[PDB]
Amino acid sequence: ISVRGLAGVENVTELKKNFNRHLHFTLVKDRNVATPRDYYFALAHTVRDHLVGRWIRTQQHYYEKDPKRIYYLSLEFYMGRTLQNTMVNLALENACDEATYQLGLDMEELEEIEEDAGLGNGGLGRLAACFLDSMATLGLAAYGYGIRYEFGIFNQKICGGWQMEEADDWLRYGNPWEKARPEFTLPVHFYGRVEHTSQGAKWVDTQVVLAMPYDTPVPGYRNNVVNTMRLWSAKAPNDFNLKDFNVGGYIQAVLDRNLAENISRVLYPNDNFFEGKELRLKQEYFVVAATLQDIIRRFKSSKFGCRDPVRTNFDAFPDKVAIQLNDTHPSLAIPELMRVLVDLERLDWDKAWEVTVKTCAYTNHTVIPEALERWPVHLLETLLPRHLQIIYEINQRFLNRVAAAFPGDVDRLRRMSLVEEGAVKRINMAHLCIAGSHAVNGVARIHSEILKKTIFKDFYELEPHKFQNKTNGITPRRWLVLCNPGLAEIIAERIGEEYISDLDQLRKLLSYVDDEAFIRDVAKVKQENKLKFAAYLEREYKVHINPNSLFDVQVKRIHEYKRQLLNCLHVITLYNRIKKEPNKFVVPRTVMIGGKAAPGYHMAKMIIKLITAIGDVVNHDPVVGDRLRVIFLENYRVSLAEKVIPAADLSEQISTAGTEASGTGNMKFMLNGALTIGTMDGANVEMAEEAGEENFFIFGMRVEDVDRLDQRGYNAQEYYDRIPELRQIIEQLSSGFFSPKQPDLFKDIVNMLMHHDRFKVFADYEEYVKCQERVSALYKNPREWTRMVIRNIATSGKFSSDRTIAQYAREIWGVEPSRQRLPAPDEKIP
Ligand SMILES: O=C(N[C@@H](Cc1ccc(F)cc1)C(=O)N1CCC(O)CC1)c1cc2cc(Cl)ccc2[nH]1
Ligand SMILES: *Cc1c(COP(=O)(O)O)cnc(C)c1O
């Protein structure tokens, strides 16, 4: 059937009886009233049963061996479905496929029933999920720490071509993969005031919120390791949230509990954009405060909570603990670690600070200013008064270091300050993270250089040893074996299975680039993937597409910097050239654009409407026929990404040079047989450097040309004046050619493009359509298109998150990865 494992005689029988055990005892149902959702839950429990033994022994193992622990703090974990991924890393896929077949069920139909764990917005959240998978596969004692939102990223709906947002009640029917640990509840404080008494400060008169943890197992790939993702949930204390007496009403007091619990209620839907709301900051401190007490409690047990030098010596703290900050969201970990170490444990400032800097590391994910976290001082002052004092003291000592290092440079002083003066004073969280971490990294070579050369130049001059690079990566398990079993099979038929946990081996596929059988195969799985997606489109969304055309797809969050608009202009150009010469031959294309817009992002929502508007005209022009279809992919999420990517021919990564830190969708496409048309931005540079530029479709300005244009001054009118085809499009948008009933509907987009285009869309237009003509020419030659594809796939090995994690571990955390199988799952009950 494929190498989804073995379908052993005894195991398929065992799986079947356990499926039935659960349908009966767990779901309280009988085959006569069980719905597909019941069957999915019976399977979920049956599979989940296989990792409880491993989970207990892994955790038990880390306790006995006591290695250095890695803690990944992120306010986002974009996990997706988890049934298939668990079967994959456990080698249960074929067994479970057989077992359900015999029970008369379709396993694929059942997997579609599982809800996505959408606790993330996009790139940042998915990276943490991939990292988790890699850290388990590499045998690292790691824990993911975050928040358990009952409502994740909103479900996107298209109404009249407009995006509509609807609550993501993903827990509605239950989450079989989480394990509530009520017995580990912790208290988090808010507000209050600071009292300075004899032997130290005291944070007093605080409001308490309880933090209840829910653990989700994270299984390593076929190595019997199961790590833990701990997500906190807000719970109201039953005392004060009722006990603070003297009228108000008893009923009201109970109802008002949903005020303390609103903290873990919903995820903020912003991607690469900062919104300074109090509720956000509360979530940020909530995850930080609970996680730290948990980390310190675990440390106090270790082997110190037995003997060792005897005396709670936090000197060894950094030898046993490493906490990674995914962006600046969990940045309050720095001042909170100081609060505990100094205010509670009573360490002297300097020892506390040495410890903090040595255990904390920070990862930067973007350079656009509107994404930077600058919290108003009055907010931190009301909510976390003690933390504000600590930040001031950290700032004081840091600026003293600066003044010493660069005497008289008064401007460098104000530029480097953690406290920004002006309208309202604010705290620059990124500056805080640099000062309190022993390492700061970019997510791609180009982005990391931009950090040192631009944004954090002053810091790089002060402490150069701190800045590193860690190019992102994706996990080959979910992004190859799970979503593209076909391509994974034909690759394994030739080079083995060892590449699944050592992607570098894909390079061996290079020697099959001239193999007639392989070329036919690689091409065959892509055709099968395209046919299946084409089917899915009519099944769940309904309105046909031609599977023989080139599948042009750009899927990611909708942003001005990602330039979905530039893709739009190319689509209109194609349409116009067809209408001009109808009986001329052109390579058929199905351009698919998908992604969610943040609810408050007006321009982004206007772009979605443009895209659907364009498809309304194009898809109904009889002269166009089936040569050009413009389709907007609804509700783009992880599970949907697993469907499109394997079916794509052209991956669109056209952000303005210097704006996309790294990108990860680009890597997903490269590994699944799509060719890439993009700019020299983020990881794109390293990808084309790995495949060779001849095997990539690069175009547009490079970082340097963008800066040259900025010195000169960007004027859109020039491009509009010199390019007739461009002018025609803009006049088509202005006159209402795409919005008849509302002729001025897109005046906002045209205005922006012409007068305030921060991402110089027009500047890259000519080179973009010229380059698109080249891919169309290569597509016309199936054999040569496929061979280039093989060059990309065979050369994507470097973008596996296992490589990224091995680097973080070795160069930042100080731990050695290991591909050693943990001692079987075998029963055991001590
Ligand atoms: O959720 C699990 N078990 C139940 C077992 C259970 C069921 C009912 C009950 F009243 C108490 C415990 C549970 O502890 N919670 C159920 C929901 C409740 O609100 C909190 C506790 C669970 C077991 C398990 C094993 C693995 Cl390997 C992974 C995830 C898991 N979740
Ligand atoms: C990988 C992924 C992303 C990131 O895409 P980019 O093109 O790097 O911005 C976002 N959302 C989902 C659903 C993903 O799978």
- Atom from ligand 2 closest to the CA of residue 662: 8
| 678 Cβ below 6 A of ligand 1 | no
Query: How far apart (Å, rounded) are the C-alpha atoms in residues 362 and 720?
Result: 43
Structure tokens at 638: 């992880």
Nearest alpha-carbon partner for 363 in 456, 494, 245 = 456
Give me the DSSP letters along 183-211: GG-EEEEES-EEEE-SSSEEEESPEEEEE
Q: How many angstroms separate the CA atoms of 572 and 737, rounded?
A: 11
Write the CA distances from 114 to 40, 43, 254, 282, integer angstroms: 8, 11, 34, 31
Could you give the 3-state DSSP secondary structure of residue 363?
strand
Beta carbons within 8 Å of 255's beta carbon, 6+ residues apart = none
The angle subtended at Cα 515 by Cα 512 and Cα 517, nearest 5°, is 115
The span from the CA of 245 to the CA of 658, in Å, is 57
CA of 175 relative to ligand 1 center, distance in Å:
10
Q: Is 151 helix (H, G, I), strand (E, B) or coil?
A: strand
125 is in an annotated binding site: no
Q: What are residue 77's phi and psi, to 5 degrees?
A: -145, 95
What's the length of the chain? Answer: 830
Partner residues linked to 651 by β-bridges: 553, 676
Sequence-distant (≥ 6) Cβ neighbours of residue 129 within 8 angstroms:
77, 78, 79, 80, 120
Alpha-carbon span 775 to 354, nearest angstrom: 55
CA nearest neighbour of 151 among 114, 181, 120, 127: 120
Choosing from 282, 374, 562, 629, the catalytic residue is: 562
Q: Whose CA is nearest to atom 11 of ligand 1?
A: 180
Tokens of 647: 């079916």
| Contact in structure between 652 and 670 (CB atoms under 8 Å) | no
Contact 594, 636 (CB under 8 A): yes
Amino acid code (one letter) for 151: F
Three-class SS state of 729 = helix
Q: Which of 225, 197, 290 is nearest to 90 (CA)?
A: 225
Would you say the C-alpha torsion 667, 670, 673, 676 has a positive or negative sign?
Answer: positive
Q: Which CATH superfamily is domain 1-473+801-824 in?
A: Glycogen Phosphorylase B; (3.40.50.2000)
Q: How many CB atoms lie within 10 A of CB 548?
A: 12
Burial of 561 (C-beta count, 10 Å sphere; 0-12/13-18/19+): middle
| In contact, 231 and 77? CB cutoff 8 Å | yes
Q: How many CB atoms lie within 10 A of CB 702?
A: 16
CA-to-CA distance for 637 and 550, rounded, in angstroms?
23
- Pull the structure tokens for residue 315: 């000197």
737: phi then psi, degrees, rounded to nearest 5: -60, -25
CA atoms within 13 A on the CB side of 412: 19
Q: How far apart are CA 442 and CA 13, in angstroms?
A: 50
Strands 226-235 and 207-219: antiparallel
Closest CA to 170 of 191, 192, 155: 155
Helix (H, G, I), strand (E, B) or coil at 143: strand
392 is in an annotated binding site: no
| 25 marked as part of a ligand binding site | no
Identify the residue whose C-alpha is closest to ligand 2 atom 5. 665
> How many A from CA of 74 to the centre of ligand 1?
24
- Residue 127 Cα to ligand 1 midpoint, Å, equals 28
Same CATH fold assignment for domains 1-473+801-824 and 474-800: yes
- How far, in Å, CA of 583 to CA of 504, rounded? 47
Q: Give the C-alpha separation, 219 to 213, whole Å.
A: 19
- Is 739 assigned a ligand-binding role in the annotation? no
C-beta atoms surrounding 280 within 10 Å = 17
The answer to whether residue 126 is catalytic is no
Cα gap 715→723, rounded to integer Å: 14
- CA–centroid distance, 659 to ligand 2, in Å, is 15
The whole-angstrom separation of Cα 22 and Cα 37 is 13
* Number of neighbouring beta carbons within 10 Å of residue 557: 24
Which ligand is nearest the CA of 640, by number? Answer: 2
> Token match 């006569």: residue?
32
65 is catalytic: no
Which ligand is nearest the CA of 671, by number? 2
| CB 337, CB 354: distance < 8 Å | no
Amino acid found at 544 = H
CA distances (Å), 248 to each of 235, 238, 241, 253, 829, in order?
Answer: 21, 16, 12, 7, 52
DSSP output for 270-306? -SS-----HHHHHHHHHHHHHHHHHHHHHHHHTTTTT
Residue pair 729/572 in contact by the 8 Å Cβ criterion: yes
Catalytic annotation on 620?
no
Q: 268 CB less than 6 Å from ligand 1?
A: no
179 lines ligand 1 (CB under 6 A): yes
CB pairs under 8 A, 24+ apart, for 412-415? 412/458, 415/458
Question: Is 556 one of the catalytic residues?
Answer: yes
Q: Could you give the angle at which helices 516-536 and 485-495 cross, rounded to 10 degrees?
A: 170
Q: In what order do the strands lie in the sheet with 697-698?
A: 628-633, 589-594, 550-555, 650-653, 675-678, 697-698
Rounded CA-CA distance 792/388 in Å is 50
Q: What is the C-alpha separation between 149 and 154, in angstroms, rounded?
A: 12
Ligand 1 contacts CB of residue 55 (under 6 A): yes
Q: What is the distance in A from the centroid of ligand 1 to the CA of 825?
A: 20
What's the CA-to-centroid distance between 730 and ligand 2, angstroms?
30
Annotated binding-site residue? 747 = no
Strand residues in 615-769 grouped as ranges (E): 628-633, 650-653, 675-678, 697-698
Residue 820, Cβ neighbours under 10 Å: how many? 11
Contact 324, 314 (CB under 8 A): no
Is 566:768 a contact under the CB 8 Å cutoff?
yes
**What gap in Å lies between CA 470 and CA 439, rounded to an integer?**
11
Q: Helix, strand, coil proportions of the chain in percent (round to 5)?
A: 50, 15, 35
Contacts of 237 (CB under 8 A, 6+ apart): 187, 208, 209, 210, 260
Q: Which ligand is nearest to the CA of 478?
A: 2
CB burial class (10 A; 0-12, 13-18, 19+) of residue 14?
middle
User: In terms of DSSP bridges, do strands 186-190 and 207-219 run parallel, antiparallel, or are they unpaired?
Assistant: antiparallel
Q: CA-to-CA distance for 585 and 587, rounded, in angstroms?
A: 7
Of all protein residues, the one whose alpha carbon is nearest to atom 19 of ligand 1 is 180
Residue 667 CA: which ligand is closest?
A: 2
Whole-number Å distance between alpha carbons of 746 and 736: 8
Q: Could you identify the atom of ligand 2 that is nearest to the CA of residue 640?
A: 13
Q: Could you identify the atom of ligand 1 that is nearest to the CA of residue 177? A: 29
Residue 777 Cα to ligand 2 midpoint, Å, equals 28
- Residue 222 phi/psi, 5° resolution? 45, 35
The residue annotated as part of the active site, out of 478, 557, 596, 605, is 557
What ligand is nearest to the CA atom of residue 175? 1
Taking alpha carbons only, the member of 656, 677, 554 closest to residue 611 is: 554
Spatial distance between the Cα atoms of 476 and 473, rounded to a whole number of angstroms: 9
Identity (one letter) of the amino acid at 580?
A: K
CB neighbour list of residue 60: distance below 8 Å, 6 or more residues apart: none
Q: Is residue 282 marked as binding? A: no
Q: How far apart are CA 144 and CA 163, in angstroms?
A: 32
Neighbours of 415 (CB within 10 A): 14
Q: Which residues, at least 6 apart from 775, have a Cβ–Cβ distance to it below 8 Å?
A: 550, 650, 675, 677, 697
Task: In whole angstroms, give the CA distance from residue 679 to residue 639.
Answer: 27
| Backbone Cα Rg of the chain | 28
Q: Please indicate if the annotation marks 161 as binding a ligand.
A: no
Encoded amino acid at 785, one letter: W
Catalytic option among 81, 412, 668, 760: 668
The finding on whether 51 has its CB within 6 A of some atom of ligand 1 is yes
Token representation of residue 821: 């199988």
Distance CA 52, CA 34 (A): 26
End-to-end CA distance of the chain: 39
Contact in structure between 442 and 364 (CB atoms under 8 Å): yes
Out of 25, 60, 90, 179, give the residue to mutate to test ligand 1, the one with the largest number of ligand atoms within 8 Å of its CB.
179
| 30, 34, 40, 41 alpha-carbon torsion, rounded to 10° | -60
Ligand nearest to the CA of 125: 2
Annotated ligand binding at 300? The verdict is: yes
DSSP, residue by residue, 550-592: EEEEEES---TTTTHHHHHHHHHHHHHHHHHSTTS----EEEE
Proximal ligand: closest to the CA of 177: 1
Q: Is 482 helix (H, G, I), strand (E, B) or coil?
A: helix
Residue 231's H or E segment, with its range, is strand 226-235
Cα diameter, the chain: 90
Phi then psi dihedrals of residue 179, to 5 deg: -125, 105
Q: Which of 216, 573, 664, 679 is catalytic?
A: 664
Is the separation of the CB atoms in 643 and 600 below 8 Å? no
Element (H, E) at 518: helix 516-536
Is residue 198 annotated as involved in ligand binding?
A: no
Which one of 556, 570, 609, 798 is the catalytic residue? 556
Contact criterion met (CB below 8 Å) for 666 and 568 = no
Check if the beta carbon of residue 278 is closer than 8 Å to that of residue 383: yes
State both tokens at 14.
């065992």
Residue 787 corresponds to which tokens in the numbers above? 């061979």
Query: What does DSSP say about strands 675-678 and 650-653: parallel, antiparallel, or unpaired?
Result: parallel
The answer to whether the CB of 267 falls within 8 A of the CB of 150 is no
Nearest atom of ligand 2 to the alpha carbon of 663: 8
Query: What's the angle, vertex CA 162, arms to CA 160 and CA 168, rounded to 5?
Result: 115
Among 57, 81, 320, 365, the one annotated catalytic? 365
Long-range contacts, 770-773 (Cβ 8 Å, 24+): 770/699, 771/677, 771/697, 771/698, 771/699, 772/570, 772/677
Report CA-CA distances (Å) from 227 to 52, 62, 462. 11, 10, 38
Helix axes 747-755, 602-618, angle to 10 degrees: 110
In the chain, DSSP finds a helix count (H) and a strand count (E) of: 32, 25
Contacts of 146 (CB under 8 A, 6+ apart): 73, 74, 75, 76, 77, 119, 128, 229, 230, 231, 232, 287
Angle subtended at Cα 320 by Cα 314 and Cα 321, rounded to the nearest 5 degrees: 90
The reply to whether 765 sits in an annotated binding site is: no
Do 586 and 574 touch, CB atoms closer than 8 A?
A: yes
Ligand 1 binding pocket includes 90 (Cβ within 6 Å): no
Pair 144, 134: CB distance under 8 Å:
no
The answer to whether the CB of 181 is under 6 A from ligand 1 is no
> Would you give the DSSP letter of residue 266?
B
**Contact by Cβ (8 Å): 139, 819:** yes
Q: How far apart are CA 477 and CA 484, in angstroms?
A: 10
Q: By what method was this entry solved?
A: X-ray
Per-domain boundaries in the chain: 1-473+801-824, 474-800
Give the right CATH number for 474-800 from 3.40.50.2000, 3.40.50.2300, 2.60.120.280, 3.20.20.140. Answer: 3.40.50.2000
15: left (phi over 0), alpha (psi -120 to 50) or beta: alpha
How many C-beta neighbours within 10 Å does residue 717 have?
Answer: 10
Joined tokens for residue 814: 């100080």
Cβ–ligand 1 contact at 217 (below 6 Å): yes
Determine the Cα–Cα distance for residues 724 and 260; give it in Å rounded to an integer. 59
Residue for token pair 């943040």: 598
As a whole number of angstroms, the distance between CA 158 and CA 607 comes to: 13
Specify the ligand 1 atom closest to the Cα of 226: 27
Phi-psi region of 586 (alpha: psi -120 to 50; beta: other; left: phi over 0): beta
Cα 580 to Cα 573, 624, 740, distances in angstroms:
10, 11, 21
Query: How far apart, in Å, are the Cα atoms of 332 and each of 144, 367, 460?
Result: 17, 20, 22
Closest residue (by CA) to atom 9 of ligand 1? 180
Distance CA 631, CA 555 (A): 11
The token pair that represents 508 in the structure block: 């061996």
Check: CB of residue 361 under 8 Å from CB of residue 325: yes
What ranges make up the beta strands (E) of 310-396? 321-326, 360-363, 374-376
Instruction: Give burial (CB, 10 Å; 0-12/13-18/19+) of 517.
Output: exposed
The residue behind tokens 């903090």 is: 356
Q: Pick the residue whose CA is nearest to atom 1 on ligand 1.
A: 179
> Which two three-digit tokens encode residue 328?
């600046």
Concatenating the DSSP letter of every residue in 212-226 gives EEEEEEEE-SSS--E
Contacts of 341 (CB under 8 A, 6+ apart): 314, 347, 351, 352, 355, 356
* 764 marked ligand binding residue: no
Specify the 3-state DSSP secondary structure of 323. Answer: strand
Reply yes or no on whether 346 is catalytic.
no
Q: How far is the CA of 210 from the centre of ligand 1 (A)?
A: 20
User: Is the separation of the CB atoms in 591 and 631 below 8 Å?
Assistant: yes
| 415, two tokens | 């530029």
What is the per-residue DSSP string for 1-59? --SS----HHHHHHHHHHHHHIIIIIT---TTT--HHHHHHHHHHHHHHHHHHHHHHHH
Which is nearest to 170 in space by CA: 266, 45, 269, 42? Answer: 266
765 CA distance to ligand 2 middle (Å):
24
30 known member of a binding site: yes
Name the packing angle between helices 724-734 and 747-755 (round to 10°): 140
Atom of ligand 1 nearest to the CA of 179: 31
For a mutational test of ligand 2's pocket, the pick from 555, 659, 679, i.e. the residue with the most ligand atoms closer than 8 A to its C-beta, is: 555
| 365 belongs to the catalytic site | yes
Which residue do the tokens 């009952």 mark?
150
Cα–ligand 1 centroid distance for 181 (angstroms): 9
Three-class secondary structure assignment of 762-819: HHHHHHHHHHHHHHHHHHCCHHHHHHHHHHHHCCCHHHEHHHHHHHHHHHHHCCCCCC
CB-based pocket (< 6 A), ligand 2: 122-123, 126, 556, 636-638, 641, 663-665, 668
Protein residue with its CA nearest to atom 4 in ligand 2: 123
Which of 517, 514, 515, 537 is closest to 525 using CA atoms? 517
Question: 291 with 332: CB under 8 angstroms?
Answer: no
